[PDB]
Write an enzyme that holds these catalytic residues in place. Structure first.
Site, PDB file in Angstrom:
ATOM      1  N   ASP A  47     -26.641 -13.461  47.224  1.00  0.00           N
ATOM      2  CA  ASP A  47     -25.689 -13.864  48.258  1.00  0.00           C
ATOM      3  C   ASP A  47     -25.783 -12.996  49.506  1.00  0.00           C
ATOM      4  OD1 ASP A  47     -23.293 -15.449  49.233  1.00  0.00           O
ATOM      5  OD2 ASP A  47     -22.433 -13.428  49.216  1.00  0.00           O
ATOM      6  N   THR A  80     -20.230 -14.884  58.346  1.00  0.00           N
ATOM      7  CA  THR A  80     -20.805 -13.555  58.201  1.00  0.00           C
ATOM      8  C   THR A  80     -22.317 -13.580  58.350  1.00  0.00           C
ATOM      9  OG1 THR A  80     -20.898 -13.835  55.805  1.00  0.00           O
ATOM     10  CG2 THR A  80     -18.905 -12.861  56.739  1.00  0.00           C
ATOM     11  N   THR A  81     -22.989 -14.492  57.650  1.00  0.00           N
ATOM     12  CA  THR A  81     -24.411 -14.692  57.892  1.00  0.00           C
ATOM     13  C   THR A  81     -24.648 -15.296  59.267  1.00  0.00           C
ATOM     14  OG1 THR A  81     -24.337 -16.849  56.801  1.00  0.00           O
ATOM     15  CG2 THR A  81     -24.834 -14.934  55.442  1.00  0.00           C
ATOM     16  N   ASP A 381     -10.659 -16.976  52.546  1.00  0.00           N
ATOM     17  CA  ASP A 381     -11.194 -17.958  53.480  1.00  0.00           C
ATOM     18  C   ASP A 381     -10.230 -19.121  53.656  1.00  0.00           C
ATOM     19  OD1 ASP A 381     -13.318 -16.330  53.769  1.00  0.00           O
ATOM     20  OD2 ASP A 381     -14.737 -17.536  52.608  1.00  0.00           O
TER      21      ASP A 381
END
Lengths: 513, 517
Positions: A47, A80-81, A381
């Site tokens: 991940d 985030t990515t 989230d």
């Protein structure tokens, strides 16, 4: 010199090189990693998102990356990515320009010119949704939640995040309900179903033992006074050369503290937050044993975190010595509650606490910490997407396809800019299309077909339509059941617009010595 | 057998695609820098266009080899734009590299290039004016007749060749039905006067054979009598023994000349002129003695020249002196010995208004170096009007048109998309390089230049403006008077797009072991 030229390129070297394999982004794509570290290890990794936070990359342009990743989390809670997937996107365009020879500071404000109009094209593709609306709050968080590790509990998690917000939210339109306001408190035991949404301040601290006060009329506060006794706070003249001199102070020690904890409970204290400071003792182990006899909730050397929330939420103030009685500057608490569910966990709940209209405490429970953390990360989230709705009103797409939607456009916007920057911004304006393929990329053989056509698909979907990255096929990504609040993606540009532009500034290198 | 990767070859392709494309980029126009040729002989030579330098440069890679092949056609028809296609080739190609380096098929985007050609071609088909006319074109001629003679040999633009070159065209332009050839007009390099000494001839000029001036120099009528045979006693342009038996017989010898002067004079005259080119060169004696007797004849002549004047007259040569005919003599509306050069004998000017299929501009030069550089100069403006007379259409280009045609195609990419989208995008940027790449050759930032008109293109499209190819403070096209036959640029559009396609040809990258071996 060549060093300023090369080090930028060398900065462009490392950071870009990392950001590429940093894109398998999302998907069930690419094969799992152990990691044998720089100084050595075996680190089994998965991940890239957490991996990004895990990422130690050490190099002048590598350190901004880990930052860049972590920010979009605290900026959004998502993407985030995604902030890094467009980072190497920026890192390419610079080259061709510097390969075209274009000046980096002229290249620099191009990033602004890209960020300036880019968010508006994002604002154009933004589908505005109400930030206080249960449904938009539910639905937006639901897309995150349904993509989170619990899509089941999400049904219970979203209204919590919806109600966590709407309580904490400023009425009607608000940029509000921070992740500081929300206090996410784990509780061992219970269930994810028993994850509890408390509007008020629940301090995650473990209450001393049990059978203590669950009753009403708490007084909670951080008390920096200590409980005196012989060989505690109180003077003695007696060195021990003998066994009796050792025992005598103790017999007077525990008794006098036993009458001090009364003054504490006499104050009305069903809780105390003990100063992390001690002298020989502060509140002794018998003292807490004596305070708990009087049903005063005590946690010795309380974690600094719950110290702040009670001062942040309730407005707690320092308190006078127990022999001075108190200032009653213990924060206002009408309930000292220790909940035990699954027979597990000790949880202080201060309800009726002074609260601003904010500070929801979501109590996160589960049969296991792993059970706890699933929803806890999921409801986050749920919180953040809603919080992203609150902070900014819209539903765009997730997954990075709407970046291509900005890309077709921002190209022409440069083409209209008609500047040297029109070459600078445009070189990136298309170069942002790279992500949907690079998400897909890291798995298999027989590669090529999807990659090029993705940006082509959306390009043939033109400005209004394109391919859904997650669900596949050409349909406008903004409303799919692949969605984000626009706050998620715009910050990714902002963050990357700058840290990357910061590389354009670097001339040569120094090392502080 | 050594087979390499097309990629690897595509490298060797792109590795060849650079310097040649580069060669022009600081050499483009007068703002471009001269191209030097040093030979296998070690001979320093300042060169021009592609084809001059490209053929002189020894081609190595298949591209280099294919370059001159493709490159000739643009100077053939148009006369100009030869320098551009080579720039244009690599420019797009070297991105097509980068595109294939994106992992893009050469297959798929090159169509888009072939296809974006037409839409740029059609965008080009918008640009400037569709018309020039006989008096009109002259000023656009004068425009290019400026820059063509305002380029190579002088930048002065003597209006001499400027309006002499067009006239030969204008003379043979209508002749061919709005067509011309550069045999059908001709640059006649011969020195004896400077660049400022030039001529336009309706026919051939040859320096008229005289073995003595006092033995009369006679030119007359309009007509030449074209002969492979004698107008005065023959000789195969070589040594011949003249002997007589006794002291007196030397006198009877000249009578034979004297009679066969008039015998040939009276023979060849009645069939037209008196002026007879005689391929046969003769000894001093009879030549001047005929110059004496009457009616000079031209001796010591190129077999081509007696042929050249004949085919110029459209009639034949008289091969045999026993033979004769008027068609086999000259069709000439003028034949006059005219003083040739400052340094030498009168030229015999055959200007043919009887029949001339060829009307030839003549040029003196103070050097061969300049008279050749002007000879090198002219064909360009000669060829552009060749386009004009067929299609009088010109396009303001060189910074008006590239970024113009590129902009629509830039937009077409987003209209079209997939394989054509990065085709038409990359298709476009190559065009915008050339005006950019002029500020490369010029003193200006190539980026901000392209940027400049890029603003102006956003302002106005297909402008009478453009960059400054003359590096004038004004960046124009109209008032740069820079322009090209919309034939040419389109024709110029075709070639690199043709070639960047030709590198894609079919499949085979295998050799016997011999590909460049």
């Amino acid at each position: 010199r060549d060093k300023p030229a090369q080090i930028r390129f060398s900065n462009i070297s490392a950071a870009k090189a990392v950001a590429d394999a940093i894109r398998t982004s999302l998907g069930p794509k690419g094969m799992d990693k152990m990691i044998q570290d720089g100084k050595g290890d075996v680190t089994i990794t998965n991940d890239g998102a957490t991996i990004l936070k895990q990422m130690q990359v050490l190099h002048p342009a590598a350190r901004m990356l880990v930052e860049l990743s972590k920010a979009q989390d605290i900026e959004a809670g998502d993407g985030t990515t995604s902030v890094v997937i467009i980072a190497g996107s920026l890192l390419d365009s610079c080259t061709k320009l510097l390969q075209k020879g274009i000046h980096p500071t002229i290249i620099s404000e191009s990033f602004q010119k890209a960020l300036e109009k880019g968010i508006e094209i994002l604002t154009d593709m933004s589908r505005p949704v109400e930030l206080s609306d249960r449904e938009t709050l539910l639905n937006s968080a639901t897309t995150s939640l349904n993509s989170k590790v619990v899509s089941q509990y999400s049904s219970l998690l979203s209204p919590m995040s919806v109600n966590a917000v709407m309580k904490v939210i400023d009425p009607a339109t608000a940029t509000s309900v921070d992740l500081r306001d929300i206090k996410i408190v784990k509780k061992l035991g219970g269930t994810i179903d028993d994850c509890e949404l408390v509007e008020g301040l629940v301090l995650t601290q473990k209450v001393s033992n049990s059978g203590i006060t669950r009753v009403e009329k708490a007084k909670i506060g951080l008390i920096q006074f200590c409980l005196s006794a012989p060989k505690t706070d109180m003077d003695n003249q007696i060195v021990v050369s003998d066994y009796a001199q050792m025992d005598r102070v103790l017999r007077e020690e525990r008794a006098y503290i036993l009458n001090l904890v009364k003054q504490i409970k006499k104050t009305g204290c069903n809780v105390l937050l003990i100063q992390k400071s001690i002298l020989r003792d502060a509140l002794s182990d018998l003292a807490l044993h004596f305070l708990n006899k009087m049903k005063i909730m005590v946690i010795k050397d309380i974690e600094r975190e719950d110290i702040e929330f009670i001062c942040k939420t309730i407005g707690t103030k320092p308190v006078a010595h127990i022999d001075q009685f108190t200032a009653d500057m213990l924060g206002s608490a009408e309930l000292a509650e220790e909940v035990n569910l699954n027979g597990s966990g000790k949880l202080l709940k201060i309800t009726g606490c002074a609260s601003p209209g904010k500070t929801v405490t979501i109590v996160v429970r589960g049969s296991n910490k792993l059970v706890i953390e699933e929803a806890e990360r999921s409801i986050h989230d749920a919180l953040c997407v809603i919080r992203c709705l609150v902070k900014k009103r819209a539903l765009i797409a997730g997954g990075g396809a709407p970046e291509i939607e900005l890309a077709l456009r921002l190209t022409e916007y440069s083409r209209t800019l008609s500047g040297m920057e029109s070459y600078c911004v445009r070189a990136f304006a298309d170069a942002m299309e790279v992500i949907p393929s690079t998400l897909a990329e890291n798995a298999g053989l027989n590669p090529i077909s999807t990659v090029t056509e993705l940006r082509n698909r959306h390009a043939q979907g033109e400005k209004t339509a394109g391919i859904n990255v997650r669900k596949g096929g050409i349909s406008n990504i903004l409303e799919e059941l692949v969605v984000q609040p626009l706050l998620v993606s715009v910050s990714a540009l902002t963050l990357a617009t700058e840290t990357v532009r910061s590389i354009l500034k670097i001339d040569d290198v120094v090392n502080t010595r | 057998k050594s087979r390499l990767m097309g990629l690897e070859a595509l490298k060797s392709h792109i590795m060849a695609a650079k310097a040649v494309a580069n060669t022009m980029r600081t050499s483009l126009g007068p703002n471009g820098l001269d191209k030097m040729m040093v030979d296998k002989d070690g001979d320093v030579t300042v060169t021009n266009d592609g084809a001059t330098i490209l053929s002189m440069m020894d081609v190595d890679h298949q591209i280099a080899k294919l370059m001159v092949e493709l490159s000739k056609s643009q100077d053939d028809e148009i006369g100009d734009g030869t320098t551009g296609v080579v720039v244009l080739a690599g420019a797009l190609l070297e991105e097509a590299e980068q595109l294939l380096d994106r992992g893009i098929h050469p297959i798929r985007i090159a169509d888009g290039y072939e296809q974006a050609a037409r839409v740029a071609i059609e965008h080009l088909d918008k640009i400037s004016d569709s018309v020039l006319v006989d008096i009109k074109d002259t000023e656009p001629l004068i425009q290019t007749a400026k820059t063509t003679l305002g380029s190579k040999v002088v930048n002065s633009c003597h209006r001499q060749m400027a309006e002499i070159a067009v006239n030969a065209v204008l003379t043979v332009a209508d002749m061919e039905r709005r067509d011309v050839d550069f045999e059908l007009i001709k640059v006649e390099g011969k020195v004896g006067g400077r660049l400022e000494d030039t001529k336009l001839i309706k026919g051939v000029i040859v320096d008229k054979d005289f073995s003595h001036p006092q033995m009369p120099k006679k030119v007359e009528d309009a007509k030449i009598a074209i002969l492979t045979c004698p107008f005065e006693p023959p000789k195969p342009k070589t040594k011949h023994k003249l002997d007589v038996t006794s002291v007196e017989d030397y006198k009877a010898l000249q009578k034979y000349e004297k009679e066969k002067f008039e015998e040939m004079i009276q023979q060849i005259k009645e069939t037209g002129a008196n002026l007879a080119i005689c391929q046969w060169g003769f000894d001093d004696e009879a030549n001047h003695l005929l110059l004496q007797n009457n009616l000079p004849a031209v001796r010591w002549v190129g077999g081509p020249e007696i042929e050249l004047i004949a085919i110029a007259t459209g009639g034949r040569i008289v091969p045999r002196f026993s033979e004769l005919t008027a068609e086999k003599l000259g069709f000439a509306g003028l034949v006059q010995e005219i003083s040739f050069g400052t340094t030498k004998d009168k030229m015999l000017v055959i200007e043919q208004c009887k029949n001339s299929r060829a009307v030839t501009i003549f040029i003196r030069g103070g050097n061969k170096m300049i008279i050749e550089e002007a000879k090198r100069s002219l064909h360009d403006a000669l060829c552009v009007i060749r386009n004009l007379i067929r299609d009088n259409r010109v396009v303001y280009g060189g910074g008006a048109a590239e970024i113009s045609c590129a902009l629509a195609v830039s937009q077409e990419a987003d209209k079209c998309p997939t394989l054509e989208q990065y085709a038409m995008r990359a298709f476009a940027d190559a065009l915008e390089v050339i005006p950019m790449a002029l500020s490369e050759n010029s003193g200006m930032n190539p980026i901000q230049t392209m940027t400049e008109v890029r603003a102006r293109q956003v302002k106005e499209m297909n402008p009478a403006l453009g960059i400054d190819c003359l590096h004038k403070g004004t960046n124009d096209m109209k008032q740069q008077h820079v322009i090209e036959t919309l034939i040419g640029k389109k024709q110029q559009i075709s070639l690199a797009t043709q070639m960047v396609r030709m590198i894609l040809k079919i499949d085979d990258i295998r050799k016997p072991g011999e590909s460049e071996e």
